[PDB]
Structure formats: structure tokens, C-alpha cells
Design a protein around this ligand. Sequence first.
Ligand SMILES: [K+]
Ligand SMILES: [K+]
Ligand SMILES: [K+]
Ligand SMILES: [K+]
Ligand SMILES: [Mg+2]
Ligand SMILES: [Mg+2]
Ligand SMILES: [Mg+2]
Ligand SMILES: [Mg+2]
Lengths: 356, 352, 352, 356
Amino acid sequence: DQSQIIAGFTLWHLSLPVTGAVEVVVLRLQADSGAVGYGEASPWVVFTGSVEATYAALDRYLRPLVLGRAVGDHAAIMEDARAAVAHCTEAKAALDTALYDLRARIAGVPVWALLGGRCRDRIPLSCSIADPDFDKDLALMQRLQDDDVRIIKLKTGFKDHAFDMMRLERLRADFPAFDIRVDYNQGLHHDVALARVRDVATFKPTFIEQPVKAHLRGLMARIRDAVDVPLLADESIFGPEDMAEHPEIADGVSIKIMKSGGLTRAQTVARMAAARGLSAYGGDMFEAGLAHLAGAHMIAATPEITLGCEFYQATYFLCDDILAAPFPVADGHVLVPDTPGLGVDVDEDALARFAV
Amino acid sequence: QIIAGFTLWHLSLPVTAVEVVVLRLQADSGAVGYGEASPWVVFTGSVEATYAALDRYLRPLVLGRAVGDHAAIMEDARAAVAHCTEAKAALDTALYDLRARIAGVPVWALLGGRCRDRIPLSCSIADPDFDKDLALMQRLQDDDVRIIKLKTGFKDHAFDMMRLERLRADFPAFDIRVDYNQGLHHDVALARVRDVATFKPTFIEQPVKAHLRGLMARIRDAVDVPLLADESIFGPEDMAEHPEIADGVSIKIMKSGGLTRAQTVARMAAARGLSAYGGDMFEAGLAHLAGAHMIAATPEITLGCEFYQATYFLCDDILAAPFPVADGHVLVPDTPGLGVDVDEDALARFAV
Amino acid sequence: QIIAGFTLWHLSLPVTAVEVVVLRLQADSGAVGYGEASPWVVFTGSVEATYAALDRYLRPLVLGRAVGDHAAIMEDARAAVAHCTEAKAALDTALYDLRARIAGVPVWALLGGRCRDRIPLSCSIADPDFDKDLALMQRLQDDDVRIIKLKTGFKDHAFDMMRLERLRADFPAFDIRVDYNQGLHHDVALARVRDVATFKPTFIEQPVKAHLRGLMARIRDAVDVPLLADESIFGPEDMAEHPEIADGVSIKIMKSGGLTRAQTVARMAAARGLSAYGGDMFEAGLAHLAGAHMIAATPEITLGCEFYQATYFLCDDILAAPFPVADGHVLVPDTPGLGVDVDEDALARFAV
Amino acid sequence: DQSQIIAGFTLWHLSLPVTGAVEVVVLRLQADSGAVGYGEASPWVVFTGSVEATYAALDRYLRPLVLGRAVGDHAAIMEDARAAVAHCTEAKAALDTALYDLRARIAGVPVWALLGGRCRDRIPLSCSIADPDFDKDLALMQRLQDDDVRIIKLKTGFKDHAFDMMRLERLRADFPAFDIRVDYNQGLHHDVALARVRDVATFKPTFIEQPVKAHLRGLMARIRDAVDVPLLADESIFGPEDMAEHPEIADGVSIKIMKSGGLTRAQTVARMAAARGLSAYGGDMFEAGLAHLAGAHMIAATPEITLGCEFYQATYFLCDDILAAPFPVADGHVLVPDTPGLGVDVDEDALARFAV
Ligand SMILES: [K+]
Ligand SMILES: [K+]
Ligand SMILES: [K+]
Ligand SMILES: [K+]
Ligand SMILES: [Mg+2]
Ligand SMILES: [Mg+2]
Ligand SMILES: [Mg+2]
Ligand SMILES: [Mg+2]
């Protein structure tokens, strides 16, 4: 049964409205038996690559390498997948996710059971605070507080520095029970980055994420050493190779299956970080509930990821998701399913509704 | 469902004796999984240390746990008892075997799926009577085995140089590696490594004591032939701490404390262009199968494996059918669990 | 004056097929400029990624801009879309071609003026049938070409060593370089590089995967023959980050994302005594001309160029007259723009 | 037309009175067609070399390498120029400037169009505050404020430390809207440099420039790491070779065509700095409007230079300039011309009036 072939390979390019729209690609794999598995690719054109690049990677270059293969050859399929097309880590993540979802459903086990088993069944949730209209986010904070969410990440550097400092002050004043992180999304020019980081460090955020452009890894290392607050690398480190090459550039790493090109490789990044005493955090892209579930299963199997996750978009940002039931969140945590595969069905009618 | 039973055997296994410890785990449903710990007292620690790790300290953290909590159980296991990586490997192996059998999948399906169904086999050449080993070689050659690892530095340097010349002369189709097992004193290690390197072995493994990692790094940089670390690197933490001491690493589940961690060492090595080889201890077939499933799911381990003891060294194994080898390769099973039944009668027979 | 038009062709070009994307930019006045993107899916990214970069993401940042704002446009282009350095090179090339034609100057007059009017040419030797390549060599020798780059590591090591010995024997007047295209596994890379170094190629290019830069640095320091980085270094940021991984760099506009940035890589290399070579991808004559004008204005690129595909590899090119080569050199034009007309009929003919 | 020869090579050694005098050398190149281009060399004897060295470099050693060459061979002329005479980067800059001005005027394009095109058409201006009579500079500050200049650089270390601290205090008090930088011009002895730098850092200047002697690059690196305020290298880094050799000695670099030996090389220094996250600033020497225009065109084509420029001398320091019209400044910015060549004509009658 482990040599049953992959007989179907189907793509949807979606546009999903948000409270704007975000574009993702969904992959379904179908085995010889008729069993199916799904994966999501969630690109950001300025950071990981375009949606068109990811679609083409799947449609033209991965498809002929996947169709007709033995589904048990998952590990060899993914080595071939990495060799076949440069970049498109999001596309690779979709493939890895669909292969895990498929083999898990065939076996009748949850995806985490294929990643080493479970160390946790809940994962603390962080919501991002990113609105240029801060009164709208103050409204959101009331809802988060009532929902028992107790972590947020302030997106900083996109308006001006006074806007960042104003929001940090007000959130610390009005919402002291919250654990607050900061994410610059590569948004500080090297002229001002250290000074701005030192200023926001005065509010003692749990971490400050990726202040400078991804390639400025030497400057990241300098900022790490200059400031007491933990520095987190995001766009500076995609996968194990980057982690190996740049061991000392930050105090921790944001783990995203869309950067690492899948679930197995995300685990490897987090294990490499932990082995030297670097923190690991469950980051995400502009994703839907399918990609969220993939990340949640990965985190459930990875004790090294201890800083929570930001799988908030399906619950708080997307007008409608693509799952058949609500992405599972209660009491400020993601609830990791224990039913087969990713644990919540993909709604193909929603795939059809949102297809471009 | 919960782990309802936890059973240990301390075995003594005659050879052509080695002591191992076998663990059986039993779920609520009656399903079972097995693992083997294979300690070497001078290297990984005593068999008594390993037995006590399992019997006293791990037993209570494992009995009554949900089998699905495998990852948490192993975190707890690492925190519960220092060393005894062999014990921890036995537990990891049993947990994978048990979960794979409950699910009806081979253990490699729990480790990422498969990248290879066959692994090239190496047999060790370590007899003080070299004529016997020359007989062994003919059998290896008839068996289509095409890799050997010469154990060096236990007699004298002339004995090692003699054997290398003879083997290159009379068996030129063999891929030859060298393993010193920490046996060269620092006074002479560089000189002797340079001498054996003239036979271009594929690698030279662990010339000096495990803790002499600065010297390992010097030997790495002095000689063109790849240097392989063994005892100097156990798990991911050692790999993270000592990134440049060698050109590659011997991956052993008994050093890494399990299957998952062994994968992580190989991946960490590969990420920087260091090689990975499927090493082993004085193990029986149960251990061999655990290592075989690990290698089957780990593309980074490209240098073969040395799972030769169940075939050429043990009088009798503890599996119900032979450990699967043919045409000089280990044949990775695709049936459920580790893929060959453990023979509980063989367990009773060889229990101390 | 403003950029009033932005047009793309996705081409498939038969070879003795490769896909490229051509961009035409059109100013208010009707003046036009062209650029080529030549992607390699395993190396720089897909042709689809490049087409989308231009069609969706760059088009709106370019249409309606003042042509004189070239430097700002390219800043915006780099910020707008990750990767797709081939797309960005096509845009840079079109912007230079258009501005040079508006001004009535060759593109090299926009890049610092000229330091050379001729560039030594290298042709690649990459046929699995070596007898065919031995025929190709006679033609190269009759054409006064005196540099070749042997593509290695795609068959086996004996095939590479065989070809080197034969070429040194039968064609001793040729400057021979070697290119592995990331093709040596880390298990064997040092050994094989050392072996091919015995033929003293002028350089050995990119033996290992692009990300294995620590290993590149080790190979650099282990072997006397110059090591050339290709895929390991794309633009100035990579050059700044990895200063000591090689003895020199292959400069390609399709990696650097343009003409200016390619100059900057060469200058950064030269400042510390690293060499620079005029590399290329599977390009047509438009790309060749962009690279040729770049090299003409960049004294630091002293190792020749490999703009051989339009002459010896493509069945038909997309220029209205032949890409200019004579006496084993590229002949840098001094007429306006890139210096040879793009044939829009050839564009229509080969569009997918 | 690109092979038309350089047929004329003419030098003037000027002395230009200032609110003292400054000595510069002007070069005019004349092509076969009669078109002309001009460049300026602006030496400082203690820093870059004497005016006599620069004059001789042009008159005896560069002249025979330039006369009769094809003007299109600009890049080869400048390689030959660098090989021909040691030092005299100012002389080399004059030659590079005149070649660009000449080819630009022949082509009918502005100089920046020969340097990659334009990224900005205005450049924020900084004026230096360097008078031993501080009341005179307080007068100047009223004029700067009314002129909408909002950057100054305080020259420090030439009187005593209390004088520096007094001026910083008063400027921060009376002119809070100004961005203030500090420049020591190599003026701190190594015995006291760190302590003095730490003291002036308390006023949070945007950068502190070259506290110690140029060769003390190890001590510069120590000062960089000891103080939060950005350290700028000036005399420690001339061109790309220095930049390559000394990558970590400061947080940024002052780019001056008179150090880099021309416009192309200045751009290369700024691109090398930016590639690793080091700042770049448009510095100058005691220059006239010709050299200012050269630097302004260079900066217009170089997005990496983001800290402004100090092309203030033609407007605020020289009693009379050598251009046919006022060096273009409005609203606190240099206005980069878009007409051919450097964009403002050189007044040869002014060359004659000021010749020694
Ligand atoms: K820190
Ligand atoms: K070695
Ligand atoms: K070398
Ligand atoms: K500093
Ligand atoms: Mg982030
Ligand atoms: Mg060993
Ligand atoms: Mg190449
Ligand atoms: Mg200065």
C-alpha cells in the first residue's frame, strides 16, 4: 500500500478577501485508492516570491515529478522537488504538506503522528496589531482580551517612529496582561535601525523581529549584541542551510513552513536553533486555515518551538476561510486536532468560490 | 491509547559474547513494539547503566502515557537520566515500532517516508589473525559485499600498513575505509594517519580520543583523505558545538539517543557539506532494523551502513527470520513496524 | 520624457529549445529599447517567474515614469519582487538601450565609457558524445577561438579526466577552464577537484552546491588552481557577505539583476584581488550584447567572456544581423544603443 | 564620434577668497569638435596632498596620457591615470569630472545620465559650523534657518572640549529643528578620544565623524563598538580599495570625489558601504561650485547616499564662485540640474580673475 501511486495533482489559485485580498495556491494530491491530501502555498511577492512563480513551480516543474510516484517515496520526492526549481519554497511547502496529509489520511493518523508524535495539544496564539488606523486595533484588542488571547505582535516601521512608540505605550498601559512582541518586517533603513530598535526595546518586548533587510546579516549580528531584548531573525533565515550558514545573527528564529519549504525542514531549523540555545517561534505568512493546520501539526511535534504561533488570520483577518469547519481556536490557543490528516476538511466549494 | 506494559530483557549473545538490553512496550490494545540498547562500556556506558536507566528512571515516565505523546515522552526521557543514550534509543525505537504497528505502516513511514529501499553494507575487518580475515573477505566477495572498514591501531602500525597493501592488491574492487576507534596516542596520530592516507581509504574514522576535538580539527586540515568523527559527536548538541572538527560524521542511534535525533545530526552535517555514514555498535538485528529504517528515510546518509553483525558475527540473532541482506545491501522492509518479528523465545534463551 | 509602452514576448528558441523573455520599452517620442531575461529554472528561477515579475509587478512601476529616472526605477524594481534577477536585468538592459538610443550613444558610453573594444571568447565543451565536441573543437580552432570551458561532473570522473588529457594533447594552444555547475557531491568534491587541478585549468568553477560556501572556502584554500564562484555569488550583497569563498567570480547580468550591479560585483572583487570573468546563461544575442557593453566598460573583467550561444548553439538568433564575433573575440559595437537591431519578426516567429 | 580625440588640456591654479583663501585647480578638456568639459581639484595639504602636487600630477603626468586619446576611452584613460602618479586623488577627480562633463555635453545629456540615471533631483544640504567666533556662527544659523536649511555639522576638537560642549548645548536649545552632526577632522589625540566622543554623544548627533587620525583604524573600530551614536569614517577611507580593506571600522563613510579620485569610484564606495549596511554621506573638501556640481550629479545617480551632502561653500563661504550663475540651492536642498553636462556654465573670466 506504501507503493500506491499518486494519480491526481490539482491546483487552485485563490483570492481571499480580508478585513484587500490575499492570494494563495492550494494543491490536492490524490492517491490510486482515491484518498486525498491538501496543501497550501502562501507567497508574499516582496519576501518569498510571487504567486505566479509558486503556481508555475507546482504546475510545470513539480507536477511531472510527483504524478505516478509511490506515495511512500515522500522523502525522495521532496529531494527531487528541491533540485527541480529554485526558490518557490511556498510551492515546496504545499507539496510537503499535501504528501503528509495524504499519507496521514491513508494511515488513519493525524499529521503530527508522521512528524515524531505529539509534545503539546495546544499552542498559544499571537495576533498581529498592524492597522494604520490604531483605533481599529484598539477595538480588536477588546475582542482578543475577551477571547483570552494574551499575545500580540506589533507591526512597526511602516508609518513613522512616533506611531510605533505611541502604540507601545498605550498597549502597555491599557493591556498589561499581554505579552507583546515587535516585528519590523525588514522595514528599518540601516541609517536608523539601531537607534529605533534601542528605543522600542525600552518597552521590553519579548522579541524584536527582523529590523533590517534580509541580506544585512552582519548588521543583524551587531544589533543582536547591542541590545538586551532578544532579536529574532525572520527573512534572514529560510531553512537549514541558512541556519547553518548564519548561526550567530540573532537570538532566535521565526520558523515558517513557507520559508523552510515544508514541515520536516521547519522542524530541522527549530532543532538546529535549540541545539545552540537560540529561541524558536511559530511564524506565518498571509495564510489560510489549511496552511495554519500544517504549521500547527508541525509545532505540535516540535518541542523546540516554545514562543507560540501566529496562526491568527483564519480567525481574525480572512472574511471567509477555506476549511469545512472553523480553524480550531479556544481560550487563546490553537487546538491541535487528533483526527486523521490535518484534522479539518478542506471545503472544495470554497476553493471554487474563491478561485481567480 | 495508553502504554500498558514495559518489559526488559538483559541478554548475552554468543559471537563467532555481547550484551544488549531489549525493551518491549505494550499498548492498551495488546499491540507491541520493541527496541534494543547496545552499550559499549568504554564508549557509550555500561549495560548496567542502560538497564537501570530503563528499569528505574524511564519506566515510570513511560507507563500510563498516551502512545501518541511520543515526542513529549522522549523530552522527558532525556531530562530524566544523564547519558544512557543507548537506553533512550531503545525507547525511541520501541515507541516508533509500536506506533507504526498500530497504524500498520513501516517505521520509515513515521520518519518522513522513504528515499531508498536498499543500503550498501560494510563489514569490519578486525581480526588479529589476518589470515582468518582473508578467508572472511572471500565470503564477502562471494556475498556481493563491496565495502569494508579496516579496524586499525590495535596491534602495531606495520600490521595496519601490511593489511592495507594486501587488500588493495588482492581485493581492488572493494571500497575501503579505516577506523581507529580512538586508538592513536596524540604523540603519533598525525604521522600514522598520514601514512594510512597513502592508500586513499574513503575515510579515516576517529584517530584520537573523543575529547581531543581540537586535534581532530588539525588532522582534518592536514590530510586530504576525509576524516570521520565518531565518538567525538553523539547528538545534535555535539554537532552544533563542534561544526568543523571533521569532514563527516558516523551516525549511530545508540549515540544520538534515538531515530529522530540521528536524522537531525545527518541533516546538520549535510547543511554545511559534511558527510554522513550509517555507523553502529555491537548490535543485534533489532537495532540493525531501527537504524535501517532511519537511513531509509534520511537522504543525507550516503556513505552506506555497517549493519553486518547479525549476518557475520552473532552466532544467533533475536529476530524470528533473518535480518534482510542480499547482494551486499541491506534490504529495507516495507511491512509494518520494523518489519521482522522479534522472537520472544530467543529473548528467553539468551536472557542472563 | 515618459515611458509610454511596455511589451513582452515569451520565446522558445531551437538549439543545435531554450526559453527567454524579451522586453521592449517605448518612450513618448517613439524611441525604443530592448532587454532579454534568460532564466534557468534550477539556478535563477523559472521563465514563468520572470515573465510574471515583468508583466504584473514591474510593468506598473515602469509605465509612465521619466526615462531619466533609471536609477530610481531599478531601486523600485528590486523592492517590488523577490528573486527574478533575470527580469530585473532585462529591465535594466532595456532602460540603458532606450536611453543610449535617445542620446545616440552606444550603451557602454552610459556605463563609464570604454576600456576595450574586443573581448576574448570562450565556448563550452559539454557534449555527452565527446567525438562531436572533438569536431566542434576543429571549428573553434579554425574560427580563431582560443578559450574553452569544459563542463564536468555530469557523466563520471573518468569521462572528465579522459577529455582533459585529450584536449591538452590535441589542442595545446587553448586556454582551458573547467565548470562543474554545482555538480560534485560534498562526499567527493575535494578529491575530484584535486584530480582535475593536475591539468592546470585556468580556473575550476563552482564544484559544489551554491549554499555550501564554507566548503567552497575550504576547496579554495586546499588547491593551487583558482576557484571561481558562480551560483554562490549573485550580486553585490552576496559579494559583500562572502568575500573569501573563492579566488574569483563569474559575473552575469542575469544573476546581478542588471548591468550596473554586475560592474559593482567586478569592482568589489578586484578591490581585494579576486578575479572576474564574463559568464552567461543560455542567452540569445540581445543578452550577449548587454553583457558585452558591460564588459567593455569594466576593466576589472579580465578573464574573457562566454557569449558563444548566439554563434554556436542557437539555430536562429533574435537580432537583425549576426551577433558580432571575429578572430575569436566579441567585437563591441560603437553605434547607438546595444548596437545591433532586434528583429521583431524573429520575436513573432519564436513567441510561444 | 565616440572616437573623437581630446585636443585641448588647460589648467588654472586659483586662489579664491572666503569669508583667508582656498586654492583649487580647474581643468578644461576640449574635444576635436570644439566641445568642452571642466573639472575641479580641491586639495587640502594636510589630508589629501598639496595643490602643487595636484597641479603637477595634471600638468606633467596626466596630460600626455589624455591629449590625443579617444574621449570614448574614458574608462581606460582613468585606469592609466591611476597607474601614472601616486596619490593626487584630487587631480584624478578633476580629470574624471572633465571627461564626464565633456562626454555629457557632446551627447546633450546631464552628467548624472552617464552615471546610471537619476534617483533624486534634490539633495538635502548641510552647512558646517566651524567659526572660532561662535557669535558669528549664531548669526549664520539665523540665515540658515530662514533659508530652510535644516542640517548642520559642527566642527569640533579645534579649540577645547568645553567650547564643543557649549556649542552643542546652545544649538540644541535654540535650533531644535536642525539635524546636527559632528566632525572632529582627525583632531582628537588617542589619549582622550573615546572620553570626548562619549561626551558629545550625549547630544545625540546623527553621526560623529573621524575623531582620530586616519591611520588609527583599529582605534576607530573600538570607538565604533563603544558608542551608540553612529561613527563616520572620512580620512580613514578614500576609495574602494580602502573600503575593501577596512570593512568594519565605522558605521558609515563620507563619500568625496576628491578622495575616491572621481565620480564612478565614489559611487562604488557608497555601494560597497550599503551592501553591508553601512551609511553613506555626501562629504566635500574646501571646494567651489564646479566640484559641488560634480558631487551633486554623482549623488543624484547614487541611491545609497542618503545622509545628505555638504555642498555649502559656494553659497555661504566663498566670496565669489567660478560658475556663470549661482550654484543651485533652494528650500534647504541642492537642486540637481537636468540640462547638459554639469548644468551650469563655468565662467572663464572668473578663472582669469582668480588665477595665481
Ligand atoms: K539581543
Ligand atoms: K581531511
Ligand atoms: K585556489
Ligand atoms: K557606533
Ligand atoms: Mg516576520
Ligand atoms: Mg567507530
Ligand atoms: Mg557556471
Ligand atoms: Mg570630514
